[PDB]
Amino acid sequence: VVGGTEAQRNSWPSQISLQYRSGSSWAHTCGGTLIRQNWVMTAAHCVDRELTFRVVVGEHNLNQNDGTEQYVGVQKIVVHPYWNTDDVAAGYDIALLRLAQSVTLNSYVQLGVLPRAGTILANNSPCYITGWGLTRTNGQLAQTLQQAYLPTVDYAICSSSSYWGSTVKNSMVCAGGDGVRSGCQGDSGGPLHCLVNGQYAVHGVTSFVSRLGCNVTRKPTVFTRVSAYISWINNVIASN
Ligand SMILES: *[C@](=O)([C]([N]C(=O)[C]1[C][C][C]N1C(=O)[C]([N]C(=O)C1=[C][C]=C(C([O])=O)[C]=[C]1)[C]([C])[C])[C]([C])[C])C(F)(F)F
Numbered sequence: 188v189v190g191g192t193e194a195q196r197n198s199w200p201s202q203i204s205l206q207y208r209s210g211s212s213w214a215h216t217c218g219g220t221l222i223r224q225n226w227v228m229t230a231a232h233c234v235d236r237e238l239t240f241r242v243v244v245g246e247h248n249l250n251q252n253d254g255t256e257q258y259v260g261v262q263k264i265v266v267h268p269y270w271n272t273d274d275v276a277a278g279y280d281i282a283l284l285r286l287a288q289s290v291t292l293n294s295y296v297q298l299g300v301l302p303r304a305g306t307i308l309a310n311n312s313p314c315y316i317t318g319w320g321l322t323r324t325n326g327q328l329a330q331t332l333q334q335a336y337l338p339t340v341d342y343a344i345c346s347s348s349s350y351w352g353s354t355v356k357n358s359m360v361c362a363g364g365d366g367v368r369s370g371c372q373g374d375s376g377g378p379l380h381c382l383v384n385g386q387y388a389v390h391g392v393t394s395f396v397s398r399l400g401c402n403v404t405r406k407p408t409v410f411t412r413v414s415a416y417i418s419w420i421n422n423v424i425a426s427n
Pocket residue numbers: 216217232233273275276320354370371372373374375376393394395396397398399401
């Protein structure tokens with residue numbers, strides 16, 4: 188997150204860290220959202236890769252023992268069947284991960300609230316991106332979980348030529364584009380939390396940014412629209 192602030196440790200309890208094995212160690216690669224005690228929602232591009240993964244729930248600081256983490260294996264990966272490798276603009280950038288165990292819930296570990304199917308946010312709706320991604324274009328991961336306020340940019344504006352044009356589809360959410368705040372590498376797969384009728388729900392799965400940088404004016408961060416995939420999600424869970 189470029190232009191982030193440190194999240195309180197109990198603000199975003201559905202955020203997870205998706206990590207890959209690196210020798211003797213584990214490295215954060217993507218975010219995700221805990222959606223069942225044994226299921227995580229992330230981006231397809233995070234997991235359509237030759238890596239071995241684990242999930243950390245109750246994670247705040249990637250570099251320090253928080254005393255709240257649960258570390259769990261990834262047992263099954265279900266990428267959306269219409270995802271195309273290395274092709275974010277074609278959409279379908281979503282995957283579900285069945286965890287090797289069911290995590291226990293607490294103020295640091297909660298299921299993400301998902302929107303009802305079909306729900307679309309009014310332009311300029313209040314949302315926060317969260318994650319440990321780069322804090323500057325070509326920078327480094329955050330240590331502590333970051334948040335940034337990214338108001339939505341509706342499809343009509345976002346798909347206009349001054350914004351993303353035809354790159355953006357109606358199965359995506361755009362948010363931000365102020366030139367200061369954005370997602371950046373390592374935020375991918377995490378939640379976009381939007382406040383509607385007094386409740387935060389996870390409306391987006393972080394997907395991609397501009398070829399010119401992370402924080403680029405009129406190039407909002409782009410997310411998979413969760414509410415377009417409710418039936419898909421439910422079918423995967425029910426079949427696995
Ligand atoms: C995420 O944390 C990360 N996402 C990305 O880096 C994604 C994954 C593929 C590359 N990518 C990008 O965001 C890149 N953009 C594009 O590849 C792209 C831009 C424009 C168009 C188009 O048609 O208009 C098509 C593709 C940029 C250049 C890095 C963050 C940024 C959410 C992780 F991948 F894990 F790093």
